[PDB]
């Protein structure tokens, strides 16, 4: 079974100006610009309408494995839309029982030095991705703030910090110490 046509329309706000160069989607908003290539999906992209622009993702003669990549295109561009308008604010939370986790941000939010994790003398230096800025959260004790335009870069920078604070040779169900992701939000809250 191959579906003749499988489409999906994406709404684009007026503050975002989008340009299509083949399959390379480029969005530009108040928070910057983004650019993600989709030449590995092998679909059709089209911008309809001058005002109130939309993004039409078409798939002709695709099986179930190929129809699944249609919404993945749309959900990625929508992340690129809210990344240049609202941004992404991933919040970390350092959980500890006895030894407090000392986090010092260096290189203007491009490096996180994790100290005093489980009382270990080794220092954990986690470098953030390009365009991702880390900052010790205010109005909270052991909370971090990761900001950026690309969700795949901010959420990956959060996984680097979280997997860095991993307990070895212990009952992880008992030693629940580490810096975990507590909230996945946006920089601008509307």
């Amino acid at each position: 079974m191959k579906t003749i046509l499988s489409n999906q329309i994406v709404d684009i706000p007026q503050n975002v100006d989008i340009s299509l160069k083949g399959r390379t989607v480029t969005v530009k908003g108040p928070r910057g610009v983004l650019r993600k290539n989709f030449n590995h999906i092998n679909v059709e992209l089209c911008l309809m309408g001058k005002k109130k622009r939309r993004l039409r993702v078409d798939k002709w003669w695709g099986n179930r494995k190929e129809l699944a990549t249609v919404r993945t295109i749309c959900s990625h561009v929508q992340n690129m839309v809210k990344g240049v308008t609202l941004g992404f604010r991933y919040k970390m939370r350092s959980v500890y029982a006895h030894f407090p986790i000392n986090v010092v941000i260096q290189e203007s939010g491009s490096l996180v030095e994790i100290r005093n994790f489980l009382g270990e003398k080794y220092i954990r230096r986690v470098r953030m991705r390009s365009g991702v800025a880390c900052t010790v959260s205010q109005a909270q004790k052991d909370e971090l703030i990761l900001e950026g335009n690309d969700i795949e870069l901010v959420s990956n920078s959060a996984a680097l910090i979280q997997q860095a604070t991993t307990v070895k040779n212990k009952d992880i169900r008992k030693f629940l110490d580490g810096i975990y992701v507590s909230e996945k939000g946006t920089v601008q809250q509307l």
Partner: protein, 134 residues
């Protein structure tokens, strides 16, 4: 990105097969592979035909669904498919390719002599503009 689609009334060019070189109108789509084409004004009666031997053209006639040959012929003549195709560069490159294959030895000699002097006149004009520009 696509401009030519397979639809009811799409005039297609048969690249190979028993009716290679003729135009047909896609009157119905049987399955993903085959269609029901019919060229009333070209000499291809109504029959099933695969899409691999078709080449979509920029001509779409307004024929109803599963209408008989009397009405498929009207839209073919209403849209002047044969007139627009004969003046299109697609057919003119086909006509030029057919004439080049029918060239005799005397025709090639006339082309050899014509192209020999035509290139030498253009080649000198290119040298003339290069000397002028400098």
């Amino acid at each position: 990105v696509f401009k030519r689609y397979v639809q009811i009334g799409r005039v297609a060019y048969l690249s190979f097969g028993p009716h290679a070189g003729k135009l047909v109108a896609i009157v119905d789509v049987i399955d993903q592979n085959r269609a029901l084409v019919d060229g009333p004004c070209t000499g291809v009666r109504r029959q099933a035909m695969p899409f691999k031997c078709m080449q979509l053209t920029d001509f779409v006639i307004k024929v109803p669904h599963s209408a008989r040959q009397k009405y498929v012929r009207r839209a073919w003549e209403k849209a002047n498919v044969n007139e627009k195709w004969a003046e299109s560069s697609w057919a003119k490159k086909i006509d030029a390719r057919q004439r080049k294959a029918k060239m005799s030895d005397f025709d090639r000699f006339k082309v050899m002599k014509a192209k020999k002097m035509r290139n030498k006149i253009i080649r000198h004009e290119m040298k003339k503009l290069q000397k002028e520009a400098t």
